[PDB]
Design a protein around this ligand. Structure first.
Ligand SMILES: CC(=O)N[C@@H]1[C@@H](O[C@@H]2O[C@H](CO)[C@H](O)[C@H](O[C@H]3O[C@H](CO)[C@H](O)[C@H](O)[C@H]3O)[C@H]2O[C@@H]2O[C@@H](C)[C@@H](O)[C@@H](O)[C@@H]2O)[C@H](O[C@@H]2O[C@@H](C)[C@@H](O)[C@@H](O)[C@@H]2O)[C@@H](CO)O[C@@H]1O
Ligand SMILES: CC(=O)N[C@@H]1[C@@H](O[C@@H]2O[C@H](CO)[C@H](O)[C@H](O[C@H]3O[C@H](CO)[C@H](O)[C@H](O)[C@H]3O)[C@H]2O[C@@H]2O[C@@H](C)[C@@H](O)[C@@H](O)[C@@H]2O)[C@H](O[C@@H]2O[C@@H](C)[C@@H](O)[C@@H](O)[C@@H]2O)[C@@H](CO)O[C@@H]1O
Ligand SMILES: CC(=O)N[C@@H]1[C@@H](O[C@@H]2O[C@H](CO)[C@H](O)[C@H](O[C@H]3O[C@H](CO)[C@H](O)[C@H](O)[C@H]3O)[C@H]2O[C@@H]2O[C@@H](C)[C@@H](O)[C@@H](O)[C@@H]2O)[C@H](O[C@@H]2O[C@@H](C)[C@@H](O)[C@@H](O)[C@@H]2O)[C@@H](CO)O[C@@H]1O
Ligand SMILES: CC(=O)N[C@@H]1[C@@H](O[C@@H]2O[C@H](CO)[C@H](O)[C@H](O[C@H]3O[C@H](CO)[C@H](O)[C@H](O)[C@H]3O)[C@H]2O[C@@H]2O[C@@H](C)[C@@H](O)[C@@H](O)[C@@H]2O)[C@H](O[C@@H]2O[C@@H](C)[C@@H](O)[C@@H](O)[C@@H]2O)[C@@H](CO)O[C@@H]1O
Ligand SMILES: CC(=O)N[C@@H]1[C@@H](O[C@@H]2O[C@H](CO)[C@H](O)[C@H](O[C@H]3O[C@H](CO)[C@H](O)[C@H](O)[C@H]3O)[C@H]2O[C@@H]2O[C@@H](C)[C@@H](O)[C@@H](O)[C@@H]2O)[C@H](O[C@@H]2O[C@@H](C)[C@@H](O)[C@@H](O)[C@@H]2O)[C@@H](CO)O[C@@H]1O
Ligand SMILES: CC(=O)N[C@@H]1[C@@H](O[C@@H]2O[C@H](CO)[C@H](O)[C@H](O[C@H]3O[C@H](CO)[C@H](O)[C@H](O)[C@H]3O)[C@H]2O[C@@H]2O[C@@H](C)[C@@H](O)[C@@H](O)[C@@H]2O)[C@H](O[C@@H]2O[C@@H](C)[C@@H](O)[C@@H](O)[C@@H]2O)[C@@H](CO)O[C@@H]1O
Lengths: 135, 136, 138, 136, 138, 138
């Protein structure tokens, strides 16, 4: 089966300047129906196709896939190659993780954090999805 | 099940300077066999791993996944951080969408468009794919 | 079904300055159990979310998904837009391939190579994965 | 997926002389996990391999597969050919039904009833089972 | 997937006195969508829980599962143990077959025939069903 | 997936006069590729549509589904309603069992036995089959 959530925060953009991972509003999968199933696995893709980060010390952004128990399943990020980008551009980002649905976890969600004091931004379509299969 | 299509236009590269989304030829999924199936869902991934864009006003490129009915399921894009890039580099791009196959849609395809008067280019492998599953 | 392999080489980072595609160690899928099956297909995703490349001639890195017979199923790469990047940044990379499991193939793996004498680097989480399906959905 | 329940009432045999269908205790399937799923169907098999019936007017027994909401999905039965059987023999019985899981039904279960005043008996292995599949 | 058909011919009971197999109307499965599919197999169950047969020479009935291309996949039947049953009773009957869906088969259906000049009867619920699966479980 | 075996012993009919269960040759399922799999379950149907039994003390026959590791999963049987049947009629028989494939089970198979000194006979089509599924459907 497929589980999927998307956002498209054009009218009210998202941002963070947190050094620690915080939730991206709306980018959460409800896996309730599949909880406590030791024979199922989720293959999870976080798709942030159009982020950017503002700042003046080689800015960038980090993303993670995290369970509701705080288990970080995967992480990665983008950064620019100049200390002060002229106009920080859009650096497409995708991240893939897996999770055994044996546990009571009912939500798998996206988080983000900054780097070197940046502010990370999302103002357009992004998604999180999973394919759930028998082991 | 899996549906899949790819291109590799090395010998005849693709380009667009269209401000409006237009088809990327060859990046189309035929989901005819699954149309009119309210119990099926497609999870669609557009993979353009090596695009670039030329131009002199912070060039970049936009991509979308669209149905044959004109439904835009997903969109996004890349851009450079310099007004006039020294040599516009390759900025990998992936986009993930979903579609309920309840409708009569028979084609799910990739589109592209420019930004700020750029020209977008593909000269190498790219793909569009879907996983089709029963809703439960 | 799902097949999955990840690496996270923080403590011992990986690098290559190979102009030819070479294996990324640890990013290999065993599909032996599914070989010689007209009836199955694999959708393979290589996810290198945080690579970079060092160099002074528009550096970058290339990646491929390949079979154990050396067949290149997919390829692509990233490059910087400056000749000598001030500090080569992280350029997320994903690649998607398909393989009919009709043949006698046993492994699907990731490879990488450099460009214009660069050195490509991975020092953090990366994965390769596949969804394997029957061509008939029942 | 498979759902299954069995009984083996050797020490405490089961019997009914009920003219109306009543439950066979223990031959019930919990399908709660699948309720409200318009894209799932259950194929249900009731297997009573060794029943008999006693009585004096062409005895026999009837069986049904029913939901918790009282819907009878299938029915059938066995009877003897003689008015008062010399010694009521074992007459194997199987019944197959189908049920869409679109509704809120939580239980699919077996029932039995008599015919012409008989008493129906089970004193050994019997089962109810279902295969649950996506419609597509 | 599941394919299923049932009848319940209470008002207009079905009967046959034919020694050769003839179709039981209404007990047919459309497998058109699955045909020409070497990767798929059907497991077919014919359930006739309440038949009887009338006659005066050890009556009974036979049933088969067959394809639209004339192929007999399974057969069997019931008979009574008395030459002239006092009142021919109900003798439950089930039959299970398998079929590869590699061929251009459109339909899998039930047939019946008599024995020793009997008349076979169905006047209540009966069904034919199949579970269709990939030969590979992924 | 589906596993299936059938026999059609017209030319050399099978019989048993054994009070103890013995294997019915040819009615065995190989589940070895699915064994040691706690996430898989088999639903097993034994279909003997046309058996009979000879004898003079209320004859009949018993059938069981069993594993190679001596587990009797299901059993049942038919009997006639007369001490000395005028002519041993055909009494259709089906039996359905379940098995978790978590164990090192290699085989699931049919057995038969007599009752009260009878001889049980099979001279036509019979089958044993299983549907194998993951415990959780997706
Ligand atoms: C080249 C550049 O940096 N431009 C800045 C302005 O941003 C652009 O503003 C326009 C609207 O005038 C538009 O919003 C652009 O984004 C759109 O396209 C991208 C894809 O490239 C995404 O799909 C967005 O969701 C779309 O809205 C936007 O440019 C994009 O963002 C900037 C930050 C760069 O990454 C650029 O390469 C991108 O193409 C900017 O406008 C302000 O910020 C934007 C995001 C929006 O909120 C506007 O309403 C704001 O005024 C401006 C002022 O800060 O500065 C530059 O000109
Ligand atoms: C550094 C740079 O910008 N170089 C320009 C030339 O492009 C390079 O040309 C070589 C052949 O001489 C080769 O085609 C390079 O691309 C190959 O590698 C990329 C991955 O990096 C892809 O896999 C391509 O499909 C491969 O062919 C090419 O560099 C790449 O493209 C440029 C646009 C940058 O994005 C760079 O970072 C990339 O590495 C360019 O050559 C002309 O354009 C290319 C695309 C090709 O059509 C050549 O045949 C053309 O001559 C040249 C003139 O336009 O300008 C620069 O030197
Ligand atoms: C801005 C820059 O290029 N800095 C260089 C140093 O790299 C940074 O070092 C810190 C630790 O001091 C940290 O390792 C940074 O990476 C972390 O963040 C990225 C995501 O951005 C990944 O998640 C990593 O796994 C994390 O560890 C690292 O910066 C990152 O890498 C460089 C190459 C750029 O791509 C930058 O934009 C990234 O943010 C660098 O340190 C040395 O190299 C790093 C990779 C690490 O191995 C350190 O232990 C090394 O000392 C330094 C010396 O070469 O040069 C710059 O200062
Ligand atoms: C031939 C006959 O009718 N026998 C009667 C007795 O029943 C048999 O008793 C033995 C024990 O001595 C045994 O229970 C028999 O059943 C076993 O085999 C059948 C399969 O044929 C089932 O698997 C049962 O679960 C098994 O236990 C039983 O015969 C069977 O039942 C009768 C009604 C007929 O259908 C016959 O053909 C069957 O083979 C009977 O014993 C009493 O009733 C049985 C059911 C049991 O409760 C015993 O404990 C009781 O003593 C006896 C007295 O009423 O009368 C006959 O002898
Ligand atoms: C004991 C016997 O043989 N009775 C004969 C009559 O048949 C019974 O008639 C009633 C009338 O409402 C009823 O139809 C009985 O069948 C019902 O129960 C069985 C299960 O046992 C099935 O589910 C049927 O679908 C139900 O309708 C019926 O008895 C059954 O059939 C006979 C042939 C035997 O097998 C018996 O053991 C069964 O229980 C018979 O009535 C006529 O025939 C029946 C089938 C029906 O068509 C009636 O409309 C007819 O009048 C009567 C005259 O031939 O002869 C006996 O009394
Ligand atoms: C000769 C032959 O093979 N005939 C087949 C049918 O079997 C015979 O069926 C009649 C039906 O009235 C009867 O049941 C026969 O057995 C009895 O009478 C014979 C002498 O005629 C002997 O005295 C037996 O001891 C009696 O029980 C029966 O023949 C026996 O079985 C067959 C299968 C051979 O093994 C044969 O050598 C035996 O003599 C057969 O009928 C079907 O099977 C029988 C056992 C019974 O269940 C019937 O109800 C069945 O319809 C038929 C269809 O299979 O094929 C031939 O006609």
């Amino acid at each position: 089966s497929i589980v999927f959530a998307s956002i498209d925060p054009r009218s009210n953009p998202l941002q963070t300047s947190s050094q620690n991972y915080v939730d991206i509003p709306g980018l959460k999968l409800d896996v309730s129906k599949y909880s406590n199933s030791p024979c199922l696995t989720a293959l999870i893709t976080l798709n942030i196709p159009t982020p950017y980060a503002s700042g003046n010390n080689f800015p960038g952004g980090n993303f993670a896939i995290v369970t509701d128990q705080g288990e970080q399943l995967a992480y990665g990020g983008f950064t620019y190659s100049s200390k002060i980008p002229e106009n920080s551009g859009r650096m497409p980002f995708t991240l893939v993780a897996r999770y055994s649905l044996a546990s009571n976890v009912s939500t798998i969600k996206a988080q983000w954090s900054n780097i070197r004091g940046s502010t990370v931004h999302i103002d357009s379509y992004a998604s999180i999805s999973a394919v759930i299969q028998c082991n």
